[PDB]
Amino acid sequence: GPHMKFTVEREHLLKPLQQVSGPLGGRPTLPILGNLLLQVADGTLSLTGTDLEMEMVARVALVQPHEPGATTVPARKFFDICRGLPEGAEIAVQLEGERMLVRSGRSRFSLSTLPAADFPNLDDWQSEVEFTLPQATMKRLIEATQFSMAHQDVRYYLNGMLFETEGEELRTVATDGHRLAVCSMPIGQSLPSHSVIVPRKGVIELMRMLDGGDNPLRVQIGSNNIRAHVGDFIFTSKLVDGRFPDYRRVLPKNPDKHLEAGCDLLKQAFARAAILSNEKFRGVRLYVSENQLKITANNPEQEEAEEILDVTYSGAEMEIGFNVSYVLDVLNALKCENVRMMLTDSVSSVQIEDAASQSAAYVVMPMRL
Amino acid sequence: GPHMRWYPWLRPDFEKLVASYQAGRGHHALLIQALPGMGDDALIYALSRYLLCQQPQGHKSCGHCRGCQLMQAGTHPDYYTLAPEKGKNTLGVDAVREVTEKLNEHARLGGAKVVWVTDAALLTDAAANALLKTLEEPPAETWFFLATREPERLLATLRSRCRLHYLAPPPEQYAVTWLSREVTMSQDALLAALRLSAGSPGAALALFQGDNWQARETLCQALAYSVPSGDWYSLLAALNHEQAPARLHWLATLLMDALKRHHGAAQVTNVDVPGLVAELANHLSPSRLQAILGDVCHIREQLMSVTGINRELLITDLLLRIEHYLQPGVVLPVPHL
Amino acid sequence: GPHMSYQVLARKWRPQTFADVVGQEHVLTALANGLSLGRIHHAYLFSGTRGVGKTSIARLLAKGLNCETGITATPCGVCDNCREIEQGRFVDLIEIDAASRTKVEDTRDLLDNVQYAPARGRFKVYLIDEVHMLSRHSFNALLKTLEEPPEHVKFLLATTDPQKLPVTILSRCLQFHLKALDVEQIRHQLEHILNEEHIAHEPRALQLLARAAEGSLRDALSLTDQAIASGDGQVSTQAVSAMLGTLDDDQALSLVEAMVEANGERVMALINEAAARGIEWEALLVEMLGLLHRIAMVQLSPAALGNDMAAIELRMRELARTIPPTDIQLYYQTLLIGRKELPYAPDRRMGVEMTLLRALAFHPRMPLPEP
Amino acid sequence: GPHMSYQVLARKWRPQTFADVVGQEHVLTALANGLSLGRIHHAYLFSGTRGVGKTSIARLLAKGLNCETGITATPCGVCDNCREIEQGRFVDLIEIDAASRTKVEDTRDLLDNVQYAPARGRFKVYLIDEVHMLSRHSFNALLKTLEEPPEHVKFLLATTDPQKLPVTILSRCLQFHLKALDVEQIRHQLEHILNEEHIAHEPRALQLLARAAEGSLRDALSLTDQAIASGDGQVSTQAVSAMLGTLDDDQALSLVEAMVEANGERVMALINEAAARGIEWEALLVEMLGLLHRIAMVQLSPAALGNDMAAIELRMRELARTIPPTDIQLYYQTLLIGRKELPYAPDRRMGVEMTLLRALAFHPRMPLPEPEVP
Amino acid sequence: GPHMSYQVLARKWRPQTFADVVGQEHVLTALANGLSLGRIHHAYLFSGTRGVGKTSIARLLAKGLNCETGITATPCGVCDNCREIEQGRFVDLIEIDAASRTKVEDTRDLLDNVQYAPARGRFKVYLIDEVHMLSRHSFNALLKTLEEPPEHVKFLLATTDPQKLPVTILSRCLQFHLKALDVEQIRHQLEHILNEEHIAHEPRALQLLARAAEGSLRDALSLTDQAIASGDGQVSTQAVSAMLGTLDDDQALSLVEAMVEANGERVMALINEAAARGIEWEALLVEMLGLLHRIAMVQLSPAALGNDMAAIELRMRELARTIPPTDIQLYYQTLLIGRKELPYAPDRRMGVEMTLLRALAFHPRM
DNA sequence: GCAGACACTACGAGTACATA
DNA sequence: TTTTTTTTATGTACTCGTAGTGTCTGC
Numbered sequence A: 001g002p003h004m005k006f007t008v009e010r011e012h013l014l015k016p017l018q019q020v021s022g023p024l025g026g027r028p029t030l031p032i033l034g035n036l037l038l039q040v041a042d043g044t045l046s047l048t049g050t051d052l053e054m055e056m057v058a059r060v061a062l063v064q065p066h067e068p069g070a071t072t073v074p075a076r077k078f079f080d081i082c083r084g085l086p087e088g089a090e091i092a093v094q095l096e097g098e099r100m101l102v103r104s105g106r107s108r109f110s111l112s113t114l115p116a117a118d119f120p121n122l123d124d125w126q127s128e129v130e131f132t133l134p135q136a137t138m139k140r141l142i143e144a145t146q147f148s149m150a151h152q153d154v155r156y157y158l159n160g161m162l163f164e165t166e167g168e169e170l171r172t173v174a175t176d177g178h179r180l181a182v183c184s185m186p187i188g189q190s191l192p193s194h195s196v197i198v199p200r201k202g203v204i205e206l207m208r209m210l211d212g213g214d215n216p217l218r219v220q221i222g223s224n225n226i227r228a229h230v231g232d233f234i235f236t237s238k239l240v241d242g243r244f245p246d247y248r249r250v251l252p253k254n255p256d257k258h259l260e261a262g263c264d265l266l267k268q269a270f271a272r273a274a275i276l277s278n279e280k281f282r283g284v285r286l287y288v289s290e291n292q293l294k295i296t297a298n299n300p301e302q303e304e305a306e307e308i309l310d311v312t313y314s315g316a317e318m319e320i321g322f323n324v325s326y327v328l329d330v331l332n333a334l335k336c337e338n339v340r341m342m343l344t345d346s347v348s349s350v351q352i353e354d355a356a357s358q359s360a361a362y363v364v365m366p367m368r369l
Numbered sequence B: 001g002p003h004m005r006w007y008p009w010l011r012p013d014f015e016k017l018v019a020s021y022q023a024g025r026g027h028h029a030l031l032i033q034a035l036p037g038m039g040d041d042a043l044i045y046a047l048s049r050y051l052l053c054q055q056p057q058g059h060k061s062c063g064h065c066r067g068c069q070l071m072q073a074g075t076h077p078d079y080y081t082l083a084p085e086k087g088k089n090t091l092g093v094d095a096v097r098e099v100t101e102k103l104n105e106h107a108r109l110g111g112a113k114v115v116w117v118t119d120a121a122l123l124t125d126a127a128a129n130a131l132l133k134t135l136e137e138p139p140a141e142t143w144f145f146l147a148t149r150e151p152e153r154l155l156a157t158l159r160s161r162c163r164l165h166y167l168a169p170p171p172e173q174y175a176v177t178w179l180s181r182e183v184t185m186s187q188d189a190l191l192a193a194l195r196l197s198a199g200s201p202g203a204a205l206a207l208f209q210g211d212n213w214q215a216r217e218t219l220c221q222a223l224a225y226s227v228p229s230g231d232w233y234s235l236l237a238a239l240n241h242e243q244a245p246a247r248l249h250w251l252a253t254l255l256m257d258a259l260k261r262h263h264g265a266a267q268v269t270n271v272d273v274p275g276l277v278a279e280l281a282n283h284l285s286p287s288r289l290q291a292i293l294g295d296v297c298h299i300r301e302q303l304m305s306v307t308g309i310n311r312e313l314l315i316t317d318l319l320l321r322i323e324h325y326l327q328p329g330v331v332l333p334v335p336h337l
Numbered sequence C: 001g002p003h004m005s006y007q008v009l010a011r012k013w014r015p016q017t018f019a020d021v022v023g024q025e026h027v028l029t030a031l032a033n034g035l036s037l038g039r040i041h042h043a044y045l046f047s048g049t050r051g052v053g054k055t056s057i058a059r060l061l062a063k064g065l066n067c068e069t070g071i072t073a074t075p076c077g078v079c080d081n082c083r084e085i086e087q088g089r090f091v092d093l094i095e096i097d098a099a100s101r102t103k104v105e106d107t108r109d110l111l112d113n114v115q116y117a118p119a120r121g122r123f124k125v126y127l128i129d130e131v132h133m134l135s136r137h138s139f140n141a142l143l144k145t146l147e148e149p150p151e152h153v154k155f156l157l158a159t160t161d162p163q164k165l166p167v168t169i170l171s172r173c174l175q176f177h178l179k180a181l182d183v184e185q186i187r188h189q190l191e192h193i194l195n196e197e198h199i200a201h202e203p204r205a206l207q208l209l210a211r212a213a214e215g216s217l218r219d220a221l222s223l224t225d226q227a228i229a230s231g232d233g234q235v236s237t238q239a240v241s242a243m244l245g246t247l248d249d250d251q252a253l254s255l256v257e258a259m260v261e262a263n264g265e266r267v268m269a270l271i272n273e274a275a276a277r278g279i280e281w282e283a284l285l286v287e288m289l290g291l292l293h294r295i296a297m298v299q300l301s302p303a304a305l306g307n308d309m310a311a312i313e314l315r316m317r318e319l320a321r322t323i324p325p326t327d328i329q330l331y332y333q334t335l336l337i338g339r340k341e342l343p344y345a346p347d348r349r350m351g352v353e354m355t356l357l358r359a360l361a362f363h364p365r366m367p368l369p370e371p
Numbered sequence D: 001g002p003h004m005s006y007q008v009l010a011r012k013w014r015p016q017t018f019a020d021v022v023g024q025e026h027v028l029t030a031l032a033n034g035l036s037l038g039r040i041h042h043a044y045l046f047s048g049t050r051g052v053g054k055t056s057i058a059r060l061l062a063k064g065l066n067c068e069t070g071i072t073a074t075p076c077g078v079c080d081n082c083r084e085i086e087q088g089r090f091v092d093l094i095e096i097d098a099a100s101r102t103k104v105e106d107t108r109d110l111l112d113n114v115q116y117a118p119a120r121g122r123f124k125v126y127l128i129d130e131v132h133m134l135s136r137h138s139f140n141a142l143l144k145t146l147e148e149p150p151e152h153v154k155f156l157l158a159t160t161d162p163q164k165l166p167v168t169i170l171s172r173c174l175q176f177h178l179k180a181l182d183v184e185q186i187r188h189q190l191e192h193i194l195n196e197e198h199i200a201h202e203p204r205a206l207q208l209l210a211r212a213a214e215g216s217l218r219d220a221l222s223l224t225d226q227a228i229a230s231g232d233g234q235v236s237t238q239a240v241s242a243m244l245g246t247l248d249d250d251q252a253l254s255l256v257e258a259m260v261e262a263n264g265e266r267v268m269a270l271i272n273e274a275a276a277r278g279i280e281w282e283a284l285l286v287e288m289l290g291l292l293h294r295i296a297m298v299q300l301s302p303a304a305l306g307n308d309m310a311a312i313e314l315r316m317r318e319l320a321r322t323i324p325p326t327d328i329q330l331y332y333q334t335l336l337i338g339r340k341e342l343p344y345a346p347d348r349r350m351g352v353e354m355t356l357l358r359a360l361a362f363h364p365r366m367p368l369p370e371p372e373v374p
Numbered sequence E: 001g002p003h004m005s006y007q008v009l010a011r012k013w014r015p016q017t018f019a020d021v022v023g024q025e026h027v028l029t030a031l032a033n034g035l036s037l038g039r040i041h042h043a044y045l046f047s048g049t050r051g052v053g054k055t056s057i058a059r060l061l062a063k064g065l066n067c068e069t070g071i072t073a074t075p076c077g078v079c080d081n082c083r084e085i086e087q088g089r090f091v092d093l094i095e096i097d098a099a100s101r102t103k104v105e106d107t108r109d110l111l112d113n114v115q116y117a118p119a120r121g122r123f124k125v126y127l128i129d130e131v132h133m134l135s136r137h138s139f140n141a142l143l144k145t146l147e148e149p150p151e152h153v154k155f156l157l158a159t160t161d162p163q164k165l166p167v168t169i170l171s172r173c174l175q176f177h178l179k180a181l182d183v184e185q186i187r188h189q190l191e192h193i194l195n196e197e198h199i200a201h202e203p204r205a206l207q208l209l210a211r212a213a214e215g216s217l218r219d220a221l222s223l224t225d226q227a228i229a230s231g232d233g234q235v236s237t238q239a240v241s242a243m244l245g246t247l248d249d250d251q252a253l254s255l256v257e258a259m260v261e262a263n264g265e266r267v268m269a270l271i272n273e274a275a276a277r278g279i280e281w282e283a284l285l286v287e288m289l290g291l292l293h294r295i296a297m298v299q300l301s302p303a304a305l306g307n308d309m310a311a312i313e314l315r316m317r318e319l320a321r322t323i324p325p326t327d328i329q330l331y332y333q334t335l336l337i338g339r340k341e342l343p344y345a346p347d348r349r350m351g352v353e354m355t356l357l358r359a360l361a362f363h364p365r366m
Numbered sequence F: 001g002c003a004g005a006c007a008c009t010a011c012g013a014g015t016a017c018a019t020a
Numbered sequence G: 001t002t003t004t005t006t007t008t009a010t011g012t013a014c015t016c017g018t019a020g021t022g023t024c025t026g027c
Ligand SMILES: Nc1ncnc2c1ncn2[C@@H]1O[C@H](COP(=O)(O)OP(=O)(O)O)[C@@H](O)[C@H]1O
Pocket: C009, C010, C011, C012, C013, C014, C015, C020, C021, C022, C023, C024, C049, C050, C051, C052, C053, C054, C055, C056, C057, C217, C218, C221
């Protein structure tokens, strides 16, 4: 246990500390799960947060004298101490036994630690495949499918989302047994099809790490684990083991009925109609007639809601009852202007797609008709 | 027997099962039937050590690998064990449900997964039924190991699922030699202890190691005092204990030997106590002995089965009913026809 | 490697079409007639003993209901829906181990999700096995759905004890009872399986396995796997007889002769000899009960006695000649109650000793020596 | 008939008007009089056993309350309201499945919307199915609602066991009780069903089905559907008898006679015949026990025998007047002990044979001979 | 609709003056004297069995306390405050369905109005109905309010089980316990109610209706309305007798009475009726066994009657006196054997019939 | 941006009760 | 006058404190 003298600046830490904060504090299930891992090595500071199944470390350059080592420092206390200091104020840290003395000007704080050995880590491994995808593209991949993930469903498959590759295309699939969200985007590199399943929480930290910067997100796909790299930030997590439902088997086989309209108008109309929907089911009935759309909603309070939309439709009239929360989420994800829908039958799955390009697609399974 | 002692009378069966497991011709759910202390725990431990890590030479331990390091330290996460909470006495269905879902969530390390129930007879009905689908269709390379002292007590819907293995008790002479080597006691005491434990050398070793021998000799002295006077109530002082079912079984064994002596059976079970069996034969009629034996067996079963039952009240009632039976002119009970 | 894990016969030989059933013809005829016509129901409850086929029958019913060939009495394995139902991963067939999830919360979530339309399947089949373990709250939750379910929903329930289920649930479903398989059907299925697996067998071993299966085919397959593991890759009469501890000599006959003669010394000497060789006690009591049944029958009809026990016919004839029927009935009753009492007083040896002493008690054991 | 959709008889033939309801004359007359005269109470509780009509009658009352022709005792099938009720899509017939919505929060939600008036209806009906399922807080949340409900809200509760409801709820709501249906009513209803639906049938099979589902009509309908499945789309005596596992009364009494008159060979022959037929042995014991009990009952009074056993009625009498009741007690005890100890016999056939042999040995009149040597 | 207008007998005829409450004389007299002398406790907690007027008497108290003519035992109907009490829309009467507003949030919100003066009444009166179910923290808030109550606020708690209430609230509340109404009072008020309405009635039918209800007036009135509906507008003896036979539940007592008198036809009819009224046969036989046990015990000491048999005492005393102990012991043994033997018998109705026949066979009745 | 506020919803824990 | 005293397994509600999540308001 050598002395640990940090001499750092706020502007170089507050963003890395925020990034490494993540799913820390909150629910402490056991003490040695710990708060942080601070490591001084080769003029770099590695700050590690964990969740007993996840890990992420931020690297901060040490342009000043340092002492290598590894120890812990409380998450909320350190974060708030660093945040509350004057803008640009320096931080000087010393270690005495198991005590951290943090000094800023004339301000002194004492902090308790735990041995670095007691901290739980993840066993190293040999990476299987690796991607270097641009940040904006990865954000587009995640946002198009994040909402559709299941909420603690018994079918563990639905609790995450799948990333797969075919040559130059990367496909992302999410589902919960009622919704399907698939999005395929170009890569620029060709790698074999090694599907991976990432749990919901891990996807949340993947979203948090992304900052829309020029640095491409690197990812190492393993067998039962995942690693990510954004600049100086490293991340790793476990994986859900199994197989996702075949999306091609879920997508409609005979999308004969076609519809096209404006995303904004449909989203606003569905939001208006969902007010009177059943708060426990959120089911709305859709009647498609010649160049006309009709949405009808009812709730146990016996209130009725009707909305009519101008649309282009060349098929036959059809009735179909489906959830309004799902279509609202789909339209929220779909940020373009014009949206197309493919329908087959009154109890057939409905495909939602961008009119500008195929890009990503969605599937909604109707309610009881 | 403190913990997991290898037993020579286990060596044959062991290798046989390995021959089944190594060739990929072993049932996923194997139900071990063995006496208490027969060593089924050691057999299951050795099997799990073979299964759960990198393949060894093909026999013995698994060598010096990550599997052995995690297993010996009890840290391997692919080695699920079902043991009743020490505060409780039975396998809560919540524990089995958690184990089954964790097993459904795929292995963590390389290799197969092993689930071991420390005792099948302690499974409650809900806990027993929570294992039916998992036994019927294990997820992938999942091997179960259930230990029991009698398969009939277990549910019929579970005995169907599991391939049953039988750990036959060792021949009596060999077990006597082994125990005499292990424990320095006279031959008669050794034989009586072995026959008391139905030929289970591990159970006899456990009986000798603890204070059970002192309790048995105290019960013998109390019975010797009580039999001629007819004051059986004093036996309460020796019968009320946490090990009451075992002492009631000892009493039933003494009554069985008394009836044997009345019929003059060439074989007995309390060899080293001829005085007590002679006194019981002399002072008690065969019908009275049979009735007392039936009542004692019934009380032992009621104590062992119904959880939470009060020991003191039952034992006192049994002793008072026996006192009533010893008095002349009292109608004896008969088995429920 | 075709067997990554040991695909035990209880799992490999699961029926895939209606023609693989071992003879549950009474329910199969109803199922085939219902599927052939338009008469289809939304709640089937198959009940019976363990390892009789009701889960397999339910899975076959689901395969027939969802195959894209149509509603066929005989499902086609070529169908993609059948390909997925025979394995896992079918979006429609939702199999719930009721004992695993007895909480009313899971049942309520299931009944919330039942409203949605099926994915690419004619009927969303809910197969709830071991339904008798569900909590009473879940039972009552499963009332209003089973009575007026959506057209695209079919409920298949399986249980080993119909009584434990509330009468209300039984009142809404088609109750099928799967009779325990007879000896001949089990033997024929076992010989067919072993011939298909290229594993040698003997007729006597198969007959013993069928006899000990107690009417359950899963028991027969488990016993066959026991024999395979302990029979060096073949089903042999010696291996199964040794593992079952069955009696080939007249030990039971000599024991009952000594007992009816009220010779306690002989009875206990024979029981000690039986303990020496480790004969299974339950089998001994079963054989004694069977011999007493034969004694009663020959007392009623001597012709009936002519059976496999021909080499020992004279002994049973003498016992029937010398023993009143009432004593035989009392002996049978005592031995039967004793058999009920084996899984009591865990040391089963003294349990059989208790039973034999109770049987001996009826006749006088007086020291009075008379011929 | 013409409907290619083979709707389940338990669903297709749900009562439409008060004329289509069989039995339950008490509740039917009470509701007809309380709806023709007026004075509609604000809470009903239909208490009865399974499959007697605890819900369909509630739906009929709902139809009778808010009908276009006013409050009527004859629910029409012409106006929109009644058909919407039957289709289950009606706006005001809030069908509260109390099994699912059992928590107190859901009951509070239900009580919150009580005053918000009915839409396209004279009354709003809160048909709470299986009220005996609500939690204690849910039970007690609706007390002051039941005691002083709004003038437009009527509760209709339907429970199987009212004893589990708190006593104050039994006080507030009307307590209508539905008796279990009789065998003749069930047979008549099934004859109506299999005449309206073009399915050939035999009266003996209908009687067997009616008796096998005693007290509950939905049980009878399900058994009849399953018998149609078992048979070639027709309810025949052979199909029903084979399906139920029951043994025809004539042959069981033949076995009983062979036991009583100490004819061992006839007993064995009948046992062999039953074995060849595949009838479950425990079912044979059950039928013999039932016949012995019926003999005891007709000894109690000759009126105890209905037309159900009429085919062998004479034989029944010829067994009642020839043997004392003590012999029946002994026979019933022996066969019942045999049934109790059957599961542990070497075989079910062996157990049944041994039980019959014991009844033959121990029966008093002309018992089995004992060995000549003492 | 097209049926004129007919209210419910339970909600109607609710008393509006203290003289219209039938029975419970001690509570009414104590309240009258307390209001006369000006001795009013801070909190009045009513308790008793169902349907004995606890809520109605509490509502009468709330009407009286805010009457403009003054605090009196007989508030007028003249006062507009009294009229608003009638209509249920009174600003100074706060009716809280504590069975619905159990959470501490709503209770605290409604108890934070103690700081505000009454709008048009002398006392801000809280009528917290069904107080027994209430969250523990809501009990804490209520206790904190009652410990230091404003002089212009009086509490009127009502409940069915006072045991569930915490002792800290009981020790601060003047508790009034209401008796179950006597049969004669119930019959008298039933006669008066049926005469005030234009409904014909019969004396024996009225007595049957009064006896059927277990001392609760709401039960009596509910059965009265149900019988009127079933009785074709007339309370006739045969119709109500048949109705109560259909609603008859204490089958086991009649079974015991018929069995001990060796009436084979009567017991057969009774068991047929108990089969039609779908029940559990094991439960019926357990009830019969328990009743026989009680009859055997009562003969040893009358004090065995207790409180449960308050509505059953008359028949049980006769059964205990008229039957020798040996016969009761034999019947108990026969029924115990029958219950042990029941599950293995055929369908349990057959087994119960057989056990009853076994018990009947002992007497020499032919 | 925007983060705090504020709502809102969910989860654990302590308590009460039911059925077997 | 003073202490004396309990049967679990499994499940289902109910209610309050603490935290996690959305979102949007003048900040
Ligand atoms: N009717 C049958 N035909 C063929 N095999 C059967 C039959 N019944 C049972 N089996 C065998 O038993 C095994 C388990 O059958 P299963 O259908 O699960 O019985 P259960 O009704 O108790 O769930 C099957 O894998 C099959 O080998």
